Amino acid sequence: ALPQTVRIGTDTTYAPFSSKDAKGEFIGFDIDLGNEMCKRMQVKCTWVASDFDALIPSLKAKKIDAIISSLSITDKRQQEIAFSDKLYAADSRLIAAKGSPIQPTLESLKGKHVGVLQGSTQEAYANDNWRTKGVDVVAYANQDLIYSDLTAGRLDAALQDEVAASEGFLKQPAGKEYAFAGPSVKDKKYFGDGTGVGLRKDDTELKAAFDKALTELRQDGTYDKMAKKYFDFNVYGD
Template identity: 30%
Template sequence: MEMLNNYPSGDMRQTVHEGRDYEMTLSRTLKSALLGVAALGLTVPALADQLSDVKAAGKITTATDMHYAPFDMLVDGNYQGMTKDLFDGVAKQIGAEPVYQDIPWTAELPGLEVKKFDIVIAPVTITPERLQRYAFSLPIADATVALVHAAGNTSLKKPEDIKGKTVGVQQGTAQFKQLQAFGEKLGGVTVKEYGTTDEAYADLAAGRLDAVAGSLPNLAYLVKARPETFALFEPATFGQPTYFAWVLRKDKDSESYVKAINDALLKMTDDGRVKAIQEKWLGTYTALPREVPTK
């Protein structure tokens, strides 16, 4: 009797049996679920990361307008300028070869958005409106808007003298918007848009314009190269101080890439390469913000 009492009754044996079946079924279900998750994981693509993609490809595809001296120029068919010198150093720091493409300015930002390029290295003025849509690198140069006139035109001296005059400027630029606002403040300026600054300079030299508006570095380089043809207003600049930078996509995938670009620029600043490049192309050095300006 005592030995029999050590074993479960018939009802109890049935309950134990059902419990074991349930445990085995649950175990098989869990194993199947885990295998399913593993199998699913094999088909889910890894999270996108632009920096990893660039390093894996071994190249950085860029876009710029190669008609924007001293930043971007074609000399005897060869690309050169301040932008190239800067980005050569950045690309080397990242560990990828730069691929330089000559793209019209009006097609650069739209092309960046649809991922035709990894970065727009044309000097682009940082504005609050653009900051809402794009990520920017650290500033690469001063971009404060300035004015240049024909060297023989002594009637134009200070920026306010452009009232009632015809002034050329590259279309779609921040300098265009600042010129428009300045002209309205003065009481009227005829603004003529150009696809490239070279076209505007040609019309100014030919007497078809009274002045050309652009960033101070561009116009200072122009006057240095052709003092017999062009002269800066005195003072040359008007409006708020602004900066040039490079443009990148503003999304989660690009965050590490943007940081790598900026880290490289900071390293080049700290070891003196940025100063040397500025002095080579601009004849002077301007200390730049170590953070992206937000205003």
């Protein structure tokens, strides 16, 4: 008894995984994976755009049935929702102006302005580690606003998923004068282990269907065909 229509929420501001083209069509690797899996599940899927922090609220309120929005599988989210198996990996990394002295350390960030997406794992991390000790951490409704404030010079740095920053901004015309600032920030407690489809705990049948379709499209080479459309590296990880 899978549903006839599955409503999938995504934030649409996190290129190359989820965004809108010029006609307003939903595009990105997450969109591709979600439609490929829907097809294999033999269900209809509708995509619903939402701010990222309203997604897990909307899932529990049954406004949507699934989240595919580079949602990191963390210990803390697992207490509220369920996840499919890993769709791809995601480390976090800071970006700042090319030739910035900035490092991801309190010492370097004290009194700087750091943007983070509200509701993300980066916001939780920065609020605990940097905001309490006086780094001016600013939370934003969506990641696009962060890039704009950054190029505007309202922010000194931003913390987000490394591949989103690299392909969605640094390799774009607007990110030409910016670069990664220090190495990836690793913290098991905050960033979880890769991303997956977020689902209500009680929707067991739906989790099994997504996991099965994911196994199948990975086994027949589709995952790699789809990922070579965006990445020249192993996006899945281990």
